[PDB]
Amino acid sequence: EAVVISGRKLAQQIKQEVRQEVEEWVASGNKRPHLSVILVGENPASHSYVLNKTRAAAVVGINSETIMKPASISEEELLNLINKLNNDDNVDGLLVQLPLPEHIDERRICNAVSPDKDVDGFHVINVGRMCLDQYSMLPATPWGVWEIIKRTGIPTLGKNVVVAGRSKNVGMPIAMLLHTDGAHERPGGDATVTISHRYTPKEQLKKHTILADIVISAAGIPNLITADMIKEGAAVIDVGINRVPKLVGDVDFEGVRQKAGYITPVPGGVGPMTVAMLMKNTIIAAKKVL
Amino acid sequence: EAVVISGRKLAQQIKQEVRQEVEEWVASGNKRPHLSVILVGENPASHSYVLNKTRAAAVVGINSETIMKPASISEEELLNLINKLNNDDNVDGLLVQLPLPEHIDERRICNAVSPDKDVDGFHVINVGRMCLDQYSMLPATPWGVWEIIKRTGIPTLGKNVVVAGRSKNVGMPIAMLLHTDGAHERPGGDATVTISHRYTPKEQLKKHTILADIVISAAGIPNLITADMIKEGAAVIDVGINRVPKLVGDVDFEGVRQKAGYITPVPGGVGPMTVAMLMKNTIIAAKKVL
Ligand SMILES: NC(=O)c1ccc[n+]([C@@H]2O[C@H](COP(=O)([O-])OP(=O)(O)OC[C@H]3O[C@@H](n4cnc5c(N)ncnc54)[C@H](O)[C@@H]3O)[C@@H](O)[C@H]2O)c1
Ligand SMILES: NC(=O)c1ccc[n+]([C@@H]2O[C@H](COP(=O)([O-])OP(=O)(O)OC[C@H]3O[C@@H](n4cnc5c(N)ncnc54)[C@H](O)[C@@H]3O)[C@@H](O)[C@H]2O)c1
Ligand SMILES: Nc1ncnc(O)c1NC(=O)Nc1ccc(C(=O)N[C@@H](CCC(=O)O)C(=O)O)cc1
Ligand SMILES: Nc1ncnc(O)c1NC(=O)Nc1ccc(C(=O)N[C@@H](CCC(=O)O)C(=O)O)cc1
């Protein structure tokens, strides 16, 4: 039977690490770090996630605020707010919760966040730097997936990995991190990585997962991954969070639990790890390391 | 037996398209496009490749100059030359031929070329834009592979693709182009893409290629791709160029020719396509579309 990895427990540990780093940063005479989160509209999942972020900030001693704005705001008004926060020396980290409304260009908005305060790692320079294996502010959810694997000791070098999903914010960075050189400035996982997506037929997906030592599902499709797709002993990391009213992942948890060696639950898996790696990025940003 | 795709004939068609585009541009009263190539040292293959590029430029109506510097040049002197070319309004395209001497930081050099003149697409902002599926100057060798596939009419949406190699200028952009969304600003091939590399066990490479509709070898290893690794009728695209006294690719050409449906030869395959796609990028740069 699979070990169930508690992302909640791993995230709490990481937050303890961040709290200590923050406290020693303040005791050294530095300003306490401050995180600003911009929330647009009323997507209730976005509100839940942002509340979890500001909770975690308080736990680790980082000052925070959520600035909530109606969906009817214009792009230029979002940009004006972002520009004010870019020039406010008290703000160390700035992020815009996604998705934004259709009349707002997410890419222009992400590129307007000063790259030094870009704790989500979505600015194009941070994307390019990550894709070149240079030091960069890593996006929180992919970095949380990497930390789950690394802190559990699941090996990656020479291993077969399948990622289901290719979104720029989640699946693509996860595939980048896992396949790239362990010896480069920002090390990668040196795994053999298959990228699948909405046009992979299920039979081709299965033919690739059945070879995989790690399967990472970030499609947002309930029961996309089932025990027959998984070779036994493999690690299955469930990035999906799907409203079905209850929350499930992409993985058939009880089925795959019988065959995988390791498995993450939804909720309590990747989700809390996302919030933890954002706290790590914020103290990194306050320290002006990059 | 396998169709042998002539990279020479496809490139000739692409180059004729560029010659028509450039002369319509010049007929409209615009400055003739101009490409500057910087060439460092005496790598015989580099000199050979640069001559192919400026020979192609002249035939399609693009003015060119190659600026040759000894390998003993320093990093500051190369940067000085690059800055002079960035500010010369006659120069539309600027590229530095790689590899550079060991004492030169290639990443610093590539980021010094202004992104609007970066016809190789090696600047971090162009790498980031490409990885976000945004309009960008695509690197010429990856774009050549893409064109070989599309112009032969080999389908990609939903097909399995294996790329052997992960280098930032060749293997990684190929994997990015092929797996990404057809509906995005810069369309992608919508394929299921496996990325293999130097830590992929040779047995594991076979188990993925035997599933592959398209194998793309960009590793620089003679005879890495052999007939037992290919399923009957798949397309095999040879990006490697290996000096073995002769030139060969990564594929066992004679053997794989008996099982593949399509195959590219070395020489005369991807190489002339690299030169051709650079001409496309140069007229794009002259038009300042981006
Ligand atoms: N911390 C977390 O766990 C966390 C954070 C953010 C988002 N998510 C969740 O991850 C899932 C998607 O995240 P995202 O940002 O990538 O969203 P997205 O909608 O942009 O991504 C959807 C991805 O699903 C892929 N896909 C669709 N059908 C597929 C299929 N049948 N097989 C393989 N791939 C398929 C699509 O091609 C696309 O790449 C959702 O449940 C989302 O809520 C989780
Ligand atoms: N126009 C062209 O045809 C053209 C242009 C440029 C480069 N190339 C060729 O591309 C090949 C590689 O170019 P590069 O810049 O990527 O060089 P590189 O050595 O930096 O990259 C080669 C890749 O090979 C991978 N690799 C090594 N062993 C492997 C294995 N056993 N199985 C799978 N992958 C393995 C490495 O991890 C690396 O990512 C060379 O032949 C180069 O000359 C061709
Ligand atoms: N959209 C974005 N825009 C900008 N930057 C980002 O990083 C994101 N992405 C997220 O914020 N992703 C995220 C997903 C889940 C949680 C989370 O806390 N999950 C709990 C359950 C909570 C619940 O479901 O109520 C769990 O999984 O246990 C937190 C963040
Ligand atoms: N290094 C770089 N730095 C900066 N930007 C780049 O794009 C590169 N990469 C190349 O320039 N790659 C390249 C490889 C081969 C040819 C070529 O013309 N090949 C012919 C003849 C081979 C022969 O006879 O020697 C063939 O294969 O048919 C052209 C370009």
Author numbering:
A (entry chain A), B (entry chain B): 36 to 279, 287 to 332
Direct quotes from the study:
Superimposition of the MTHFD2/15/21 complex structure on the MTHFD2/NAD+/Pi/21 complex structure reveals that upon the binding of 15, MTHFD2 induces dramatic conformational changes, including the shift of the βe-αE loop in monomer A, destabilization of the αE′-βf′ loop, and movement of the αD2′-αD3′ loop in monomer B. The structure of MTHFD2/NAD+/Pi/21 was obtained by cocrystallization of MTHFD2 with NAD+, phosphate (Pi), and 21. In addition, NAD+ also forms hydrophobic interactions with Thr176 and Val205 and hydrogen-bond interactions with Arg233, Ile276, and Thr316. In the MTHFD2/NAD+/Pi/21 structure, Arg233 binds to the phosphate ion and NAD+, providing evidence that Arg233 contributes to the phosphate binding and assists in positioning NAD+. Furthermore, in the absence of 15, His219′ in the αE′-βf′ loop binds to phosphate.
The MTHFD2 gene is upregulated in various cancers but very low or undetectable in normal proliferating cells, and therefore a potential target for cancer treatment.
